Amino acid sequence: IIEAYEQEDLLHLEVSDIPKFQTYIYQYSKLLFRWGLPLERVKILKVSTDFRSSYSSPYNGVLTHWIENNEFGEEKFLARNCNYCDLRVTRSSFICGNCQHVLHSSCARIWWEIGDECPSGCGCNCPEMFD
C-alpha cells in the first residue's frame, strides 16, 4: 500500500516487460510514412522515445543567436520583442534573413494575409527575401 502510494505511474513497466517495442514502433512509423499520415508517425515515435528516455541527430544543427548590442534602457527590452504585437518572443518564432526581425507564429500567420512588407517598416519584402 505504501509503495502504491509512492508512485504516480499506472504500471511499473521495464525493458524486459516489453522486449521489442522499438523495432515494431519504428517499422510501423515507416509504414505510416508510406501512407498519407505523417502526424501519427511523429506521435508513435514520441511515445517510443518518451519511454526510451524514461528508462535511460538529424533534427539539430541549427541554433538561433541574438544580436549582441550594448543598450541601457527601453531598447534593450525591445530588442528581443515581436515586431507586430510588441511582446516578448520566447517560443515559436519566425526569422527573416534580409532584415533580422522576429515575429510570432500567430503574428506572422495573421500579418502575411494582409501584409506585403516588414511590420517594423524597414523596407524589406519579407515574403520574397527571408532566404
Partner 1 sequence: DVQSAALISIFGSPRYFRDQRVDEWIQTYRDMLKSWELFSMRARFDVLRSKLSRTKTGVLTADIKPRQIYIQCQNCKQNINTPKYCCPHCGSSFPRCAICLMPLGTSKLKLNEWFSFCLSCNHGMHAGHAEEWFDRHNVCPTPGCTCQCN
Partner 2 sequence: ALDTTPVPNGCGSCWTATGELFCFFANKNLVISKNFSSLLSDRKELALEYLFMDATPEGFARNNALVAEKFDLDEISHCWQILSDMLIDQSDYDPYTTIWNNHPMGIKWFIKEAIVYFERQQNLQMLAMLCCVILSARR
Partner 3 sequence: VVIANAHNELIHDAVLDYYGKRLATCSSDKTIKIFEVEGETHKLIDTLTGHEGPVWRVDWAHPKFGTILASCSYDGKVLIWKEENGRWSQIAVHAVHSASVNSVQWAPHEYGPLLLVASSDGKVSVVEFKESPIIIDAHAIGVNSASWAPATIESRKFVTGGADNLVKIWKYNSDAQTYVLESTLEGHSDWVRDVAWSPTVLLRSYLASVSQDRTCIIWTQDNEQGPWKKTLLKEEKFPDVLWRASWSLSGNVLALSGGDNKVTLWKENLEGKWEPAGEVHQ
Contact residues toward partner 1 (CB under 8 A) are 33, 38-39, 42-43, 45-46, 49, 53, 57-67, 69, 75, 78-80, 83-86, 89-95, 97-102, 105-123, 126-127, 130-131
Give the nearer residue to partner 2 in terms of CB position, either 48 or 83: 48
Cell matching residue 56: 535511460
Cell matching residue 105: 507564429
Cell matching residue 110: 495573421
- What CA–CA distances, in Å, run from 90 to 72, 117, 120? 21, 23, 19
Q: Which amino acid is at 64?
A: T
90 binds, among partner 1, partner 2, Zn ion, none (CB under 5 to 8 A by kind): partner 1
Give the nearer residue to Zn ion in terms of CB position, either 44 or 99: 99
